[PDB]
Subunit: 149 residues, 3 copies
């Protein structure tokens, strides 16, 4: 009896795990995730980079990072307003790196940017037309997270 | 070994619990939930107050209640059209109360409202410009639910 | 110990099942699901019919099929642009059938359609009028999946 009950429960667990994964798939789809593409999403809340990072991490994602022009446009249409990207030049000034590791491949800087103005600007925001502007990490911008393809 | 399988099952259940909690958090975030703020959702369906209550209750939420101007604006944006609020004077005519209990504090009544017109109006709808009007609970208005912060 | 823990885990599993059902209801409501009505969802991606069937199949739904004018309008509004319907005449030219099986009840063909132009047209797209046109299954149109009422 006990070995049988346990086996049956193990089967119920497998089914439940698959059903949750399905729920996750349907949700991503409803929010616009394209086949074979990363899922970008926002709650339209503006906050400092430290909070965006903590927030996306809490949902098991990361701050949105455009790896090419196509993902840049995707993040642009999701954000609507100015949003932080998971890129900073905190280690060596001018050397932008992804918060998940590695040197910057694709970039879409605005005219006269990055300019590290004032006391300094080590974070990055995607703004109007999808162009980039380095900004203070302490400034508040829209939180956009990315989840794997 | 029975005991080893039971321990694995405890681990599988805990993992499931944590992933479902994550699914709930990601969904709220995608629906616009701001940090430390309750969030609002609607399917844009219009129905009598009693139905809205049942529906929200069934989702472990409650008909939306504006506790301040920010929340009121947020509800207004989600709704898009006239929607019921979790406020009524059903228990004692003239004394509006929250469906979850307590006398109404913050309010945003249109001029000359509430007016309990006709045979009476004991429900409340957020309408044009986000102002409020008491209306018959039997009329159909947009169902908007609120969930905890 | 053994038996008590097993009984607890059974209640844990049942509790999880109820919670996930709850999450699915909340998600459906946010996706726009109207009471007792089937609902349509899209990620706004355009792709060939085969990829639409595959994508909807993964999510345990089916390619959208309008059964009457009301459902046909619902699909139109969700898609916004041309979208494939779960209808084709791939089996027998001239004879449209549902992908779920069966001959065509409701139809909303644009004048002179279906015409199987040029090399051939075995799929159907609901256009920007709500009307239908048979088109190549290899063409890319918006993916709209359907879930039960
Ligand atoms: O110091 C912040 C930022 O200021 C300047 O850019 C302006 C801002 O991004 C914002 O206020 O919008 C303006 C356009 O409406 C934009 O010019 C630049 O000096 C920039 O380099 C700097 O990071
Ligand atoms: O905004 C005024 C009032 O409008 C609607 O009710 C109407 C009025 O009470 C009045 O003019 O009589 C009409 C029927 O003869 C009635 O429709 C409602 O929206 C009401 O709640 C509102 O206060
Ligand atoms: O609305 C008619 C027809 O339009 C589109 O196809 C075009 C026509 O078949 C025709 O004029 O020739 C064109 C190629 O030279 C062709 O694109 C399609 O929407 C078709 O399905 C429709 O029947
Ligand atoms: Ca620096
Ligand atoms: Ca810098
Ligand atoms: Ca700058
Ligand atoms: Ca009364
Ligand atoms: Ca009254
Ligand atoms: Ca009134
Ligand atoms: Ca054919
Ligand atoms: Ca054909
Ligand atoms: Ca045609
Ligand atoms: Cl900075
Ligand atoms: Cl009433
Ligand atoms: Cl074809």
């Amino acid at each position: 009896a006990i070995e049988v009950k346990l086996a049956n429960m193990e089967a119920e667990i497998n089914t439940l795990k698959s059903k949750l994964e399905l729920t996750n798939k349907l949700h991503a789809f409803s929010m616009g995730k394209k086949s074979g593409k990363k899922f970008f999403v926002t709650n339209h809340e503006r906050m400092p980079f430290s909070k965006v990072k903590a927030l996306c991490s809490e949902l098991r994602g990361t701050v949105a990072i455009p790896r090419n022009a196509e993902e840049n446009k995707a993040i642009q249409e999701v954000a609507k307003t100015s949003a932080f990207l998971g890129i900073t030049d905190e280690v060596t000034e001018g050397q932008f790196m992804y918060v998940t590791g590695g040197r910057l491949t694709y970039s879409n800087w605005k005219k006269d940017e990055p300019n590290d103005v004032g006391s300094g600007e080590d974070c990055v925001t995607i703004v109007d037309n999808g162009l980039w502007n380095d900004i203070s990490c302490q400034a508040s911008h829209t939180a956009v997270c990315e989840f794997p393809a």
